[PDB]
Amino acid sequence: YNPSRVEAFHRYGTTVNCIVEEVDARSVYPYDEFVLATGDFVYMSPFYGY
Amino acid sequence: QLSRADITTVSTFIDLNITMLEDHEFVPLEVYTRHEIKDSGLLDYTEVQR
Numbered sequence: 521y522n523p524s525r526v527e528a529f530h531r532y533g534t535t536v537n538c539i540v541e542e543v544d545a546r547s548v549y550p551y552d553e554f555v556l557a558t559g560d561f562v563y564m565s566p567f568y569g570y
Numbered sequence: 571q572l573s574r575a576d577i578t579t580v581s582t583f584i585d586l587n588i589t590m591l592e593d594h595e596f597v598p599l600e601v602y603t604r605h606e607i608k609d610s611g612l613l614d615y616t617e618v619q620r
């Protein structure tokens with residue numbers, strides 16, 4: 521989404537697209553953190569819990 | 571009576587010396603370990619992203 525056309529004026533148009541994906545996570549010893557298929561690091565052990 | 575070793579003895583047999591093959595132990599040897607090959611790269615995407 522972009523703002524409608526108004527002459528000699530700046531306009532701001534916000535777009536929010538919810539996205540959900542199934543990614544393959546990987547982890548290595550000591551398994552204290554894991555990465556995702558998108559290359560994002562997650563600094564939490566995959567087995568962390570209560 | 572005289573001993574058996576008092577007379578000169580000549581070997582009537584055609585000696586054949588047989589030297590068995592000595593046991594050999596093979597130790598591990600690698601020109602470049604898998605860790606060295608990984609370290610050969612100037613940059614590592616895993617460490618840089620982390």
Ligand SMILES: *[C@@H]1O[C@H](CO)[C@@H](O)[C@H](O)[C@H]1NC(C)=O
Nearest residue numbers: 581583584585586587588589
């Ligand atoms: C080995 O063989 C040679 C002949 O090739 C013989 O003269 C010798 O006595 C043998 N034994 C030893 C311990 O050298």
